[PDB]
Amino acid sequence: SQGLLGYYFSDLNFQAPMVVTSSTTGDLSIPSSELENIPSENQYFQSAIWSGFIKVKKSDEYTFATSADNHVTMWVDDQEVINNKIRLEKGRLYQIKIQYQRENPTEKGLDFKLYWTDSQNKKEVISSDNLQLPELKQKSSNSRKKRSTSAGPTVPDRDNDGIPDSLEVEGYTVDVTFLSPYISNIHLTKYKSSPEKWSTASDPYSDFEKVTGRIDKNVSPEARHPLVAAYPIVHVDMENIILSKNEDQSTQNTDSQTRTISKNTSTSRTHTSNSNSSTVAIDHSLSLAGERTWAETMGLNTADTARLNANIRYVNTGTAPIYNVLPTTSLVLGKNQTLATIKAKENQLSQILAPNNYYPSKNLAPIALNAQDDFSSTPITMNYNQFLELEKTKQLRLDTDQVYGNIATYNFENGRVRVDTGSNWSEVLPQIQETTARIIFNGKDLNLVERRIAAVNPSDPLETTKPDMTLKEALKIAFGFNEPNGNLQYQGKDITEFDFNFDQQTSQNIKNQLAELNATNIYTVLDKIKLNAKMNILIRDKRFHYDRNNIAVGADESVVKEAHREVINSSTEGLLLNIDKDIRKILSGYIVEIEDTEGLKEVINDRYDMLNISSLRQDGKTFIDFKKYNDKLPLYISNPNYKVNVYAVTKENTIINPSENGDTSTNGIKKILIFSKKGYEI
């Protein structure tokens, strides 16, 4: 992605840029054959400017020449060499500026080459190994000045990202790599960006770096748009836990039987601020014999303590990767009882933590909080009262900071992306947060995904130089909504299948906009609602009920019923159905009941911890197993007029402890009838 940077103009005076691109060698030509996305009238180039550096591998005297010296002025550093021998020294970098003007060319495109001749009189087009791009960064480097010589033309590029002011403001496209003005009736993505922000989203990648692919390949595709922020978002996923009674100096004997408690866990990133937090649910379903308390199970007295181990992974749901610092996490019981601080070793990561991925990767083992080969893992200890609290709440919280370490950035000297020790996420995130609107959307699998989109702040003059951002456009560019036939959709689902919720400031702002639009319904004017910096917008699938963490925990009876209508097979052994994956996510289990002729009901799996009777098969269909908690026996129906009733239990209606009186039965559980057939119908 290296060479000289070229601006090719339709007018004579460097005002109407048609193509911005880079060469590889001194051949700076663009044939008309490559100009499909330029209309023919504007393929006539009357002026051009090139910029970059020349690197010398042999100290010598050199003569520069082009294909059109009578139309050219060229500077090496501040020195005009065309408008002649110049001594250049090995190991040194010289700035190049070339301008070309030719009125009324008769051919489209441009045939243009840059040559040099050494002392041996050998003339050649300059090799790619001798040419570098300009330093299109916010600061110069030790060897590479960020501005070109003042002599000659200065194409307006107030932020030094390489994209001319006029294209950033008026609209541009990139084609396979030609950057050109966007023209409705020919074109491809329409980009606009701020001509005064090197990164319009205030992230660490320039607007030009994003649209030309001069960027970390791990940056999410949507964040190659100059108006979508590229930044990591990390939380911790806990997969399972094991609780152990701590040994004490008094117990000399360590030969005792296994008395640990092992449970699966389910973790979700939450939204209730710019914090990273996830909430863990400890499974309440049957795992051990008896119906003992956890203390009875593990042999804990009131003066004993217990410890927890667990398997975890880190999850990046953001748009940029992390390389050398994983964030620190606090493991919290109840509201504010910190049980552990979880850290990884800085500068010793075994892999990248990339967007839409895990650390460790899912094809590798997870991390154990107390690793078998770590002598120095701190025991995560609870006192007896804390242990009882965990038994009752079956909940933990993982609060993760935003300490993400160093950033891999592009270097124009060599075209490489490398971790830059001088660039840190902690210097970048505050400004992303301050200048963007935040949308949290759960249409991908019901988990909360945050994106930030550049948006004007009317009260910050710099931020008013950014383009207007509508709500519709933000959903398209940040989340991949599309609009086939007028209607805005996400993966086939109309936008009207999702609700809108806002913070208090954002809500008043939107309400005022709708009033100025005399619009009674936001869904019909999404192209006219403008976002502003610091808005917070939460968009959720309407089929579901949500808890205080905005985790999906249930759904209307009508929705759940309809989701279970399509029965494939029924028998005394169970039911086989096709159920939407999203529905399965909000269920904790099923209750199976036999109803006799007088209306009395026998619940088969009549325990709060015996509802986990469904499984997903390879075919993707669900089996509800009547036998599992019926002693591996099918249901015995003593009269064909008896009914088999099956009920679904949503998570919000799930009982996770015996009742106050000790009753472990299902009496009182709010449950949704989803199947009811007589024996002769089975």
- Which residues carry a binding-site annotation for Ca(2+)? 157, 159, 161, 163, 168, 194, 197, 207
Q: Which is nearer to Ca ion, 163 or 223 (CB)?
A: 163
**Could you tell me which residues come within 8 angstroms of residue 645 by beta carbon, excluding any fewer than 6 positions away?**
592, 593, 594, 595, 601, 673, 675, 676
Q: Which is nearer to Ca ion, 161 or 463 (CB)?
A: 161
- State in angstroms the smallest separation of the CB of 226 from Ca ion: 7
**What is the C-alpha separation between 553 and 586, in angstroms, rounded?**
5
Stretch that binds Ca ion, among 97-105, 140-148, 161-169, 565-573 (CB under 5 A): 161-169
Within positions 2 to 61, which residues make up the interface with Ca ion, using CB under 5 A?
A: none
Q: Is 203 in the site for Ca ion (CB under 5 A)?
A: no
- State in angstroms the smallest separation of the CB of 156 from Ca ion: 8
- State in angstroms the smallest separation of the CB of 219 from Ca ion: 17
Stretch that binds Ca ion, among 61-69, 83-91, 185-193, 232-240 (CB under 5 A): 185-193
Strands 93-101 and 72-76 come out as antiparallel
**What is the C-alpha separation between 268 and 647, in angstroms, rounded?**
26
Q: Which is nearer to Ca ion, 212 or 622 (CB)?
A: 212
**What is the C-alpha separation between 470 and 464, in angstroms, rounded?**
14
**What is the C-alpha separation between 310 and 315, in angstroms, rounded?**
16
- State in angstroms the smallest separation of the CB of 165 from Ca ion: 6
- State in angstroms the smallest separation of the CB of 166 from Ca ion: 10
Stretch that binds Ca ion, among 205-213, 351-359, 364-372, 674-682 (CB under 5 A): 205-213
Residue type, 499: D
- State in angstroms the smallest separation of the CB of 207 from Ca ion: 4
- State in angstroms the smallest separation of the CB of 208 from Ca ion: 7
Q: Which is nearer to Ca ion, 15 or 377 (CB)?
A: 15
- State in angstroms the smallest separation of the CB of 38 from Ca ion: 20
Stretch that binds Ca ion, among 195-203, 276-284, 363-371, 466-474 (CB under 5 A): 195-203
Name the residue among 104, 129, 132 with its Cα closest to residue 46. 104
For the chain, the maximum distance between any two Cα atoms, rounded to a whole number of angstroms, is: 111
Structure tokens at 489: 């959709």
Q: Which is nearer to Ca ion, 17 or 355 (CB)?
A: 17
- State in angstroms the smallest separation of the CB of 465 from Ca ion: 9
| Dihedral sign from CA coordinates of 76, 80, 81, 84 | negative
- In sequence order, the β-bridge partners of residue 334 are none
Q: Which is nearer to Ca ion, 193 or 588 (CB)?
A: 193
Each residue 106-145 as x (binds Ca ion by CB under 5 A) or -, in order, gives ----------------------------------------
**What is the C-alpha separation between 194 and 186, in angstroms, rounded?**
24
Q: Which of 161, 209, 463, 473 binds Ca ion (CB under 5 A)?
A: 161
Q: Which is nearer to Ca ion, 52 or 195 (CB)?
A: 195
**Could you tell me which residues come within 8 angstroms of residue 33 by beta carbon, excluding any fewer than 6 positions away?**
109
One DSSP character per residue, 238-274 reads: EEEEEEEEPP-TT-----PPP--EEEEEEEEE-----
Q: Which is nearer to Ca ion, 212 or 650 (CB)?
A: 212
Stretch that binds Ca ion, among 25-33, 131-139, 204-212, 465-473 (CB under 5 A): 204-212
Stretch that binds Ca ion, among 59-67, 201-209, 318-326, 662-670 (CB under 5 A): 201-209
Stretch that binds Ca ion, among 93-101, 188-196, 411-419, 661-669 (CB under 5 A): 188-196
- Pair 168, 108: CB distance under 8 Å: no
Within positions 279 to 338, which residues make up the interface with Ca ion, using CB under 5 A?
A: none
User: Binding site: residue ranges?
Assistant: 157, 159, 161, 163, 168, 194, 197, 207
Stretch that binds Ca ion, among 156-164, 305-313, 433-441, 615-623 (CB under 5 A): 156-164
Q: Which is nearer to Ca ion, 4 or 325 (CB)?
A: 4
Q: Is 157 in the site for Ca ion (CB under 5 A)?
A: yes
**Could you tell me which residues come within 8 angstroms of residue 533 by beta carbon, excluding any fewer than 6 positions away?**
434, 435, 436, 437, 455, 456, 457, 460, 463
Q: Which is nearer to Ca ion, 208 or 481 (CB)?
A: 208
- State in angstroms the smallest separation of the CB of 386 from Ca ion: 53
Stretch that binds Ca ion, among 102-110, 157-165, 516-524, 579-587 (CB under 5 A): 157-165
- State in angstroms the smallest separation of the CB of 159 from Ca ion: 5
Residues that contact Ca ion, how many (by CB under 5 A): 7
**What is the C-alpha separation between 532 and 516, in angstroms, rounded?**
16
Name the residue among 389, 275, 383, 380 with its Cα closest to residue 327. 275
Q: Which of 10, 53, 159, 282 binds Ca ion (CB under 5 A)?
A: 159
**What is the C-alpha separation between 326 and 359, in angstroms, rounded?**
9
**Could you tell me which residues come within 8 angstroms of residue 121 by beta carbon, excluding any fewer than 6 positions away?**
none
- State in angstroms the smallest separation of the CB of 200 from Ca ion: 5
- Pair 180, 188: CB distance under 8 Å: no
**What is the C-alpha separation between 526 and 483, in angstroms, rounded?**
12
**What is the C-alpha separation between 424 and 39, in angstroms, rounded?**
43
Q: Which of 173, 193, 402, 436 binds Ca ion (CB under 5 A)?
A: 193
- State in angstroms the smallest separation of the CB of 198 from Ca ion: 6
- State in angstroms the smallest separation of the CB of 455 from Ca ion: 15
Structure tokens at 83: 């408008």
Q: Which is nearer to Ca ion, 434 or 494 (CB)?
A: 434
Alpha carbon of 316 to those of 1, 228, 642: distances in Å?
A: 28, 16, 52
Strands 367-368 and 234-245 come out as unpaired
Q: Which is nearer to Ca ion, 159 or 450 (CB)?
A: 159
Q: Is 163 in the site for Ca ion (CB under 5 A)?
A: yes
User: Which residue in the block uniquely carries the two structure tokens 């009131």?
Assistant: 302
Q: Which is nearer to Ca ion, 467 or 574 (CB)?
A: 467
Q: Which is nearer to Ca ion, 167 or 398 (CB)?
A: 167
Length of the chain measured in residues: 682
**Could you tell me which residues come within 8 angstroms of residue 628 by beta carbon, excluding any fewer than 6 positions away?**
605, 613
- In sequence order, the β-bridge partners of residue 652 are none
- Identify the DSSP state of 2: -
Alpha carbon of 46 to those of 5, 9, 104, 151, 161: distances in Å?
A: 17, 6, 7, 20, 24
**What is the C-alpha separation between 332 and 71, in angstroms, rounded?**
72
Structure tokens at 455: 């948006």
Stretch that binds Ca ion, among 137-145, 192-200, 352-360, 664-672 (CB under 5 A): 192-200
Each residue 511-540 as x (binds Ca ion by CB under 5 A) or -, in order, gives ------------------------------
Write out the residues near Ca ion by the rule CB under 5 A: 157, 159, 161, 163, 193, 195, 207
